[PDB]
């Protein structure tokens, strides 16, 4: 006896991943970039840069 | 010689062969196909397609 055509159904699922990357800031840069330690001193501008 | 064996016409006879296939269809299909188990709702006119 012959064979009827066959049909197939299949589901598949994802996988979960991430990518981590740390990035730090010193205690003094937090002052300089913020804007508290800057004042009318040409040195402070250089350190800000 | 003037005899019988002058045959140079061996015979070739046909043989019959065939092919088959199976094409089953479900019971709920032809119901909608022939419009027998059908109603005016948008749903039954979608399953028919």
From TrEMBL, chains A, B:
Signal peptide: none annotated. Coiled coil: none annotated. This is Major capsid protein. The gene is UL19.
């Amino acid at each position: 006896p012959a064979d009827q055509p066959v049909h197939n159904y299949m589901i598949k699922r994802l996988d979960r991943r991430s990518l981590n990357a740390a990035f730090s800031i010193a205690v003094e840069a937090l002052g300089l970039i913020s804007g508290e330690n800057l004042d009318g001193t040409h040195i402070s501008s250089a350190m800000r840069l």
